[PDB]
Ligand binder design. Sequence first.
Ligand SMILES: CN1C(=O)C[C@@](C)(c2cccc(NC(=O)c3ccc(OCC(F)(F)F)cn3)c2)N=C1N
Length: 365
Amino acid sequence: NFLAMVDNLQGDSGRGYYLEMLIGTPPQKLQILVDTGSSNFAVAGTPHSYIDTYFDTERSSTYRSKGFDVTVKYTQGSWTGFVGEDLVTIPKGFNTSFLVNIATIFESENFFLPGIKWNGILGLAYATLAKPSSSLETFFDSLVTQANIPNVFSMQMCGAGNGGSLVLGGIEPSLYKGDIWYTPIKEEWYYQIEILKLEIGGQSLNLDCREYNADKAIVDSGTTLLRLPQKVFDAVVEAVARASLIFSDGFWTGSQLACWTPWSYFPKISIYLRDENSSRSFRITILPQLYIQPMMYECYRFGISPSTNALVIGATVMEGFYVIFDRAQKRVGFAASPCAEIAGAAVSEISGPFSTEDVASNCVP
Ligand SMILES: CN1C(=O)C[C@@](C)(c2cccc(NC(=O)c3ccc(OCC(F)(F)F)cn3)c2)N=C1N
């Protein structure tokens, strides 16, 4: 029933796309961040002054404790929760109960932030990232097993410049347009893909392709901006600045906004990805509309930021496409998305193929 998995995500103007879930018996309703960058299902298990609601295990007759807690740390934020299992329903999609592992948070720091509307997280990446270990089966793996659905999910995020769709168990034709292009997953932990080349206003950066996979290049719906390793971030900033000619130093680091559209003053940025046939590639392109972001005449943020360790294709880039996480065939797909528009104007482009003769056979160090 793919057509009832349409418009099941709310985007609350850029603070994460979240899905509504009924958890336990009788059902408690949560709002859950959809995150392709982690692998735990974790929800608030006690009151917190920044959330409206939490999951109370004592009010569920089908909840079973698993007899250990788990501590998770991120670069920013951390939490400890009890591990247990309970029944889950997704009203917009899966109105049949499946039993999943769940972490109920009773201690945290800089995790529930003021104004945020989600009170848990749905981690959709591979078991290898699961905490405390890969043997804690992930939500999607439980769904695949119990529902006999294919091992594929996909995502349309429609909030460029208000929500979108998570399709569990497949692909929805009305959500994309034209051809799907697939790039292999290189490692099944994150959705790690192989980036071959960055191009600014039609000119490629002068950097070894291994810089782009410096550690890892990943597709992560739980990250806001396009994130780039420092070296790559600094080269991109120079290439953008020179190709537009308008800037205070603080615009590039996110410490100032620029107030004025400006979009015609900035260049396209293209990411080249290896195609499932290794001898070609395809590119995804974002227009200034996605990375020069109106915040409220208007005032604008640079939608790219530095990372210590990863190139992260985050939610702002994903708003430019229909994205297919084809676990079964070990690939990620990208297609043009009808809803990737600001007042009818396109925000993004996708094209291919291109030869990969000018580039190393393996760009992943
Ligand atoms: C990066 N990352 C982490 O650092 C750990 C973890 C669990 C995490 C933890 C806490 C919050 C978040 N993410 C978010 O709050 C968030 C907020 C807005 C987001 O999208 C904004 C927009 F949709 F692009 F506009 C995406 N994620 C992610 N997931 C991640 N993917």
